[PDB]
Design a protein around this ligand. Structure first.
Ligand SMILES: [Cl-]
Ligand SMILES: [Cl-]
Ligand SMILES: [Cl-]
Lengths: 82, 87, 84, 87, 83
C-alpha cells in the first residue's frame, strides 16, 4: 500500500471484460511528507475518490479482490502523522 | 496498471506453449504527461493494439487471466486522458 | 521481507471493507545498518507495533495471510540484528 | 516479460526439490535498443537457451507454471525485435 | 531469483506464527561480477546457510499459510559469466 493523489482519469472503450464499469484514475505516489515522487500509476476507483484527494492505493494480486486489476484505491486518507 | 505506447513487436518461434497465438508488443511506459520514461516492457496484446497507440498495461498475476506464463498484457486502449489541479 | 521503522500512522474512514478495524502504519525501509532509505510504505499492523520500533514487513500475496486487499503488513518485531 | 541476454550460468547442489534438474542462467536485462542495462537476474532455462542469445523472460507467479520456487524463467528465444516511430 | 551474500541474521520474538522456528538472514543482492549492490533483504533460510555464503534467493509467492516473500532456495556452487 502507498499514499497517492488522484491526478486525473483515464477513459477506454476497447478494454477487458473485467474492466467493465470501472473508473480509471491517474494516481501519483506521494512520500511520507506528502510530496509526490516521479512515480505515477493508473488505478481503479472503488471507494469513489475525487480529484486532489489523498487516497490509499493497494497494488498487485491484492488489488484483484476489489479482475485483471493490479492497482486500486482501497481508502481515502482522513489524516496522516509522521 | 500503467500507461504505455506500442513502440514495436517481438517475434519468437521457440516459445512456451502458453504463448501460442499471442502477439508480443514492445511497450514503453509513459508518464501522466504521456512522455515515455526509460522503462520498457514486452507485453501480450489481447485487445488488438497497433503501433503508436496508447494502451493500458496490466502486470503480474492479474495479467494471467487474459496456466499462462504471461505477466504483462494490454487490457485496454486509451480513449482520453485528463490531468488536473484543483482549488 | 525487509527491515523498517514505524514512522507514523494513517487514518481513513472511507476505506475498503477488508480494511475495517486495521491499524495503518507508515513504515520507512531500513538498510542492514538500520539506516532508513528514501522509500516509505503504508503497512497494516498485526503484531501491535509502536512508534520508533523496528519491524519486519512482508509484502505481496504473502501479506494477504494476515481475500484481503492487503499487500504489505508487519509480521514481526525485530529483537536484534547483526551484520557479520 | 522483458528482453534479456544469457550472460552465463549458475550451479547449485544444495537447492530446493523443485529446482532439481534445472539450468540456472544469468540473464542481463536489455532495453528496446538491445542495450544491456545494469539489472541482472538468475532465471530458469526451459526452452533451452545458449550464451549470447536474446530471450524473453517471464517473472513472478507466472514463472511457477513452467509448487515451484521459480519466480523468473525463460519462456522464449527472440527471433527479431522491431522498434518503430509512426507519422 | 537473484544472487545474494549472507551478511547477517535477524532475531524476532513477537513474530507471525508461520515464522515460528525460522532463521531470518540479511542478504545483500549481488551483481553478475558478485559485487554487492545497495539492495538488501531479509530472507528465510531453508537449506541452512552460513555467513559469507553465496546463495540463490527466490522472492514473491514462490517463496511461500506462509507470509514469506523471500527465501533462500539454494547455495551457489560455481558461477560463470561469458563475455
Ligand atoms: Cl464500461
Ligand atoms: Cl540437480
Ligand atoms: Cl519461535
Amino acid at each position: 500500500m502507498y499514499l497517492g493523489k488522484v491526478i486525473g482519469t483515464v477513459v477506454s472503450t476497447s478494454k477487458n471484460e473485467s474492466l467493465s464499469g470501472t473508473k480509471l484514475l491517474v494516481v501519483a505516489r506521494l512520500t511520507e511528507k506528502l510530496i509526490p515522487d516521479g512515480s505515477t500509476q493508473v488505478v481503479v476507483d472503488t471507494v469513489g475518490a475525487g480529484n486532489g484527494e489523498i487516497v490509499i492505493v493497494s497494488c498487485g494480486s491484492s488489488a484483484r479482490q476489489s479482475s485483471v486489476i493490479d492497482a486500486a484505491v482501497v481508502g481515502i486518507v482522513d489524516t496522516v502523522e509522521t
